[PDB]
Design a protein around this ligand. Structure first.
Ligand SMILES: [Cl-]
Ligand SMILES: [Cl-]
Ligand SMILES: [Cl-]
Ligand SMILES: [Cl-]
Ligand SMILES: [K+]
Length: 239
């Protein structure tokens, strides 16, 4: 349950980051830059959790809808295919979620973001990028609470919608343990910010929420978010 080791982990990967842990409304901070936890960063793709919630609750889409790829080149070849909301969730396929955001529209999206009170709750005028380059910003502490509420089905949306989004977030399942989460990586801002937000469902159903937030660099493999999370959750004996 320390705290200096976990500091060494961040130290070793030459990054600046924080790991926010929330266990039944008790919050703990870890990593090598704890002041990040109350610092506002753009959510990047972590916002997909909320985008989906808003989209499903307002019936702009459903979990079965197949989003058609219409041929434009995308940032990743893995994105160039028809997919569902859930598939797009697993791949962080931005263009699908931008299509969703456009269906929702600026009015509906702004209203929802403030009703939920997400981060600074400002989305500006472009409904299809506000979470990648601003103006929307959120603290890693705000994210762990958000995701904690989602895990407990406590967000101001219908339970079926929350359960549908939770089902899209399963990352690993081993030894009676479940890890749910969403990565983010805002590459077009400086400094770059990487996220891994989610929760652990322990074999007895106890839920432990986490929000990893770290400064990123282009040379980094994306899986560095996963490694820094996974070895920390092991140190704290959460898995
Ligand atoms: Cl602490
Ligand atoms: Cl520190
Ligand atoms: Cl079906
Ligand atoms: Cl591109
Ligand atoms: K250090």
């Amino acid at each position: 349950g320390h705290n200096q080791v976990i500091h060494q982990y961040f130290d070793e990967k030459n990054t600046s980051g924080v790991l926010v842990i929330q266990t039944d409304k008790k919050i703990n901070l870890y990593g090598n830059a704890l002041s990040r936890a109350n610092t506002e960063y753009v959510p990047a793709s972590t916002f997909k959790m909320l985008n989906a919630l808003i989209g499903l609750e307002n019936q702009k889409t459903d979990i079965n809808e197949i989003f058609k790829w219409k041929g434009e080149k995308r940032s990743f070849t893995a994105w160039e295919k028809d997919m569902t909301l859930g598939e797009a969730m697993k791949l962080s396929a931005v263009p699908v979620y931008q299509e969703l955001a456009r269906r929702i529209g600026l009015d509906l999206m702004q209203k929802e973001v403030k009703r939920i009170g997400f981060g600074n709750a400002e989305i500006g005028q472009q409904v299809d990028n506000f979470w990648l380059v601003g103006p929307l910003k959120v603290t890693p502490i705000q994210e762990v609470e958000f995701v904690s509420q989602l895990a407990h089905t406590q967000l101001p949306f219908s339970e079926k919608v929350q359960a549908n989004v939770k089902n899209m977030l399963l990352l690993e399942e081993s030894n009676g343990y479940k890890i749910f989460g969403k990565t983010g990586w805002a590459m077009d801002i400086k400094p770059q910010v990487g996220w891994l937000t989610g929760w652990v469902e322990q074999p007895d159903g106890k839920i432990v929420a986490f929000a990893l937030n770290m400064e990123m660099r282009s040379e980094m493999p994306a899986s560095i978010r996963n490694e820094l999370l996974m070895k920390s959750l092991k140190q704290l004996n959460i898995i």
